[PDB]
Amino acid sequence: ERTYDESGSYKVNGFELFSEGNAEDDDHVSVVVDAGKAYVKGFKVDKPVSTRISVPKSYDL
C-alpha cells in the first residue's frame, strides 16, 4: 500500500520481448519474454528465467 501510494507500478529490470518463431504450431508465433523484476500495484514480482509466450496468427480478411 505504501509502495503503490509513494511510487506506483514500475519495472526494476528484465522482461524484454523478442520474436523467435519456434514451430510449436503453424498457427502461432512464439515470442520470448526475458527474466525480470518489477513492482505491480505495490507488490513485488521477481522471475529468474525467460517465459515463452505465443500469439495467434492473423487471418481476418
Partner: protein, 61 residues
C-alpha cells in the same frame, strides 16, 4: 486492421503492468517485438535530469 492503421488495444487496468507491444504482420511468421515497460528512475537519475534542466535554462539565458 491494415498495417498502416493497426494500433494496440487500449487498457486502463491499474492492477496489471504493460511489458511491451508485439506486431504480427498479415499471414506471416514475422513478428516485431518492442519494449515499452515503466522502467524506474533512482534519486541519482532525477538529479541528472535536474542538472540537464539547469543546462537548458542557462543555454536559454
Amino acid at each position: 486492421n491494415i498495417m498502416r492503421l493497426v494500433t494496440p488495444p487500449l487498457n486502463t487496468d491499474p492492477e496489471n503492468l504493460q511489458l511491451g507491444t508485439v506486431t504480427v504482420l498479415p499471414d506471416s511468421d514475422e513478428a516485431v517485438c518492442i519494449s515499452f515497460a515503466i522502467t524506474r528512475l533512482s534519486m541519482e537519475d532525477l538529479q541528472k535530469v535536474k542538472t540537464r534542466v539547469d543546462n537548458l535554462e542557462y543555454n536559454q539565458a
